[PDB]
């Protein structure tokens, strides 16, 4: 109920934080895994905003209140949580650093914020669930149901006293950035991704793609959002594999609720069907991740390491299917 607000101790604590020097180098790399540095996550986000957008892009007090309140509005769910938020934001930073002047200052700040915020107040339930059982959210938001909620939650956070990090923008740039953020968040609806990716592939292959064309820009940004949302699949295998455990933990909890409502869940969400997971992952990589990073690499060549990593993980799932797994810890 209502929007949660960070404590003074929380945001002041973040203000005083300094990132260990060794990580400054690592954070630049696509494969960087935030996993082992939980206490540093919010500081890691400040760092990325500061490197990408300058230490004066936002008032530091407002930025630190914003970040710690964002954290407090992620729920303690197995996957769509704070850790996922910072991970997605880190992928965006890496894409932007490698593609820096293709994007405006306003686009970089909006996108880094959009990624941090893009799953705000996720409950561990899919759009499929919300719509199947007519959750109130589905009444309010007929398509892209959770994504429209994530955007609404973002704007609610900006509206907290002292949290409006975009207040100092010109009224016109203010409207532009909220639009950048809205579009970016809505684009994290995977339902939209299939069409977007297909469109982009065609525009690329015919050579009509034009980043001076706002609709094209929006689409490229959309695909960047997908690439970042799915970046678990671009990490080193052990990291990818542990993250998959958390994702399925959420799926099986949803499947359980469906069973209570008289409906057998899709196999992916069925905890009595774990034998099908390796094949399910294969389908996911072949249908979603591989094409995503393939097209992104065509459009932004510096993102190639994402695609190489995703390819290596596909291979690992293939090995699992064939019975070639080595030891795994959970
Ligand atoms: C977000 C997501 C969803 C699925 C089915 N697999 C993976 N790896 N990631
Ligand atoms: Ni989402
Ligand atoms: Ni997400």
**Are the beta carbons of 178 and 205 closer than 8 angstroms?**
no
Which CATH class name applies to 1-330?
Answer: mainly alpha
177 lines ligand 1 (CB under 6 A): no
Give the ligand whose atoms come closest to the C-alpha of residue 284.
1
Q: What is the resolution of this structure in A?
A: 1.8
Ion ligand 3: residues, CB < 5 A? 119, 229
Ligand 1, atom nearest to 251 Cα = 5
DSSP letters spanning 37-59? GGGGHHHHHHHHHHHHH-TTSS-
Q: Is 35 helix (H, G, I), strand (E, B) or coil?
A: helix
The helix or strand, by DSSP H or E, that contains position 283, with its residue range, turns out to be helix 277-284
172, with CB counted inside 10 A (0-12, 13-18, 19+), is exposed
Q: Does the beta carbon of 284 sit less than 6 angstroms from any atom of ligand 1?
A: yes
Alpha-carbon gap, residue 136 to 147, rounded angstroms: 14
Give kind and range of the element (H or E) at residue 151: helix 145-158
Centre of ligand 3 from the C-alpha of residue 206, in Å = 31
Instruction: Please indicate whether residue 290, judged by its CB atom, sits closer than 6 Å to ligand 1.
Output: no
Of 137, 85, 136, which is closest to residue 115 (Cα–Cα)?
85
Protein residue with its CA nearest to atom 9 in ligand 1:
230
* Residue 95 tokens, joined: 């894409």
Domain boundaries, the chain: 1-330
Ligand 2 ion local residues (Cβ < 5 A): 119, 188
Number of helices (H), then strands (E), belonging to the chain: the values are 16, 0
Query: How many Å apart are CA 192 and CA 178, to the nearest integer?
Result: 20
Ligand 1: nearest atom to the Cα of 244: 8
Cα 247 to middle of ligand 1, angstroms? 7
Q: Is the CB of 269 under 6 A from ligand 1?
A: no
Q: What is the DSSP string of 168-207?
A: TS-HHHHHHHHHHHHHHHHHT-HHHHHHHHHHHHHHHHHT
Among the listed residues 115, 108, 117, 118, the one whose alpha carbon sits nearest the alpha carbon of residue 49: 108
Q: How was this structure determined?
A: X-ray
Task: Tell me the backbone φ, ψ of residue 74, rounded to 5 degrees.
Answer: -85, 135
Q: 117 is written with which tokens?
A: 């915020």
Beta-carbon neighbour count of residue 62 at 10 Å?
A: 18
- Which residue in the block uniquely carries the two structure tokens 């399925």? 248
Q: Which residues are catalytic?
A: 80
Structure tokens at 248: 């399925």
162 contact partners, CB below 8 Å, separation of at least 6: 61, 62, 65
Tokens of residue 41, six digits = 């996550």
- Tell me how far apart the alpha carbons of residues 181 and 301 are, in angstroms, rounded to a whole number: 24
Check if 267 has its Cβ closer than 6 Å to any atom of ligand 1.
no
Cα 228 → chain centroid: 5
Protein residue with least CA distance to atom 4, ligand 1: 284
- Tell me if 116 sits within 8 A of 157, measured CB to CB: no
Q: Is 119 annotated as a binding residue?
A: yes
């Amino acid at each position: 109920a209502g929007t949660s607000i960070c404590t003074s101790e929380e945001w002041q604590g973040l203000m005083q934080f300094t990132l260990p020097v060794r990580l400054c180098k690592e954070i630049e790399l696509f494969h960087f895994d935030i996993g082992p540095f939980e206490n540093m996550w919010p500081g890691i986000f400040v760092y990325m905003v500061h490197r990408s957008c300058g230490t004066s892009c936002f008032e530091l007090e407002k930025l630190c209140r914003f970040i710690m309140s964002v954290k407090k509005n992620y729920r303690r769910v197995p996957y769509h949580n704070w850790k996922h938020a910072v991970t997605v934001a880190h992928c965006m930073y890496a894409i932007l650093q490698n593609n820096h002047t293709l994007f405006t200052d306003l686009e970089r700040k909006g996108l880094l914020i959009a990624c941090l915020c893009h799953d705000l107040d996720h409950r561990g339930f899919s759009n499929s669930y919300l719509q199947k059982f007519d959750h109130p959210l589905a009444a309010l938001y007929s398509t892209s149901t959770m994504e429209q909620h994530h955007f609404s939650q973002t704007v609610s956070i900006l509206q907290l006293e002292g949290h409006n990090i975009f207040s100092t923008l010109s009224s016109s740039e203010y409207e532009q950035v909220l639009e950048i953020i809205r579009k970016a968040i809505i684009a994290t609806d995977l339902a939209l991704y299939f069409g977007n990716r297909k469109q982009l592939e065609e525009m690329y292959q015919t050579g009509s793609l034009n980043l001076n064309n706002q609709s094209h820009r929006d689409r490229v940004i959309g695909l960047m959002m997908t690439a970042c949302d799915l970046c678990s699949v671009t990490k080193l295998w052990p990291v990818t594999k542990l993250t998959a455990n958390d994702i399925y933990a959420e799926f099986w909890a949803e499947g359980d609720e469906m069973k209570k409502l008289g409906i057998q869940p899709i196999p992916m969400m069925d905890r009595d069907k774990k034998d099908e997971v390796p094949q399910g992952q294969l389908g996911f990589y072949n249908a979603v991740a591989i094409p995503c990073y393939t097209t992104l690499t065509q459009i932004l060549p510096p993102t190639e390491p994402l695609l190489k990593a995703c390819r290596d993980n596909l291979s690992q799932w293939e090995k699992v299917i064939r019975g070639e797994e080595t030891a795994t810890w959970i």
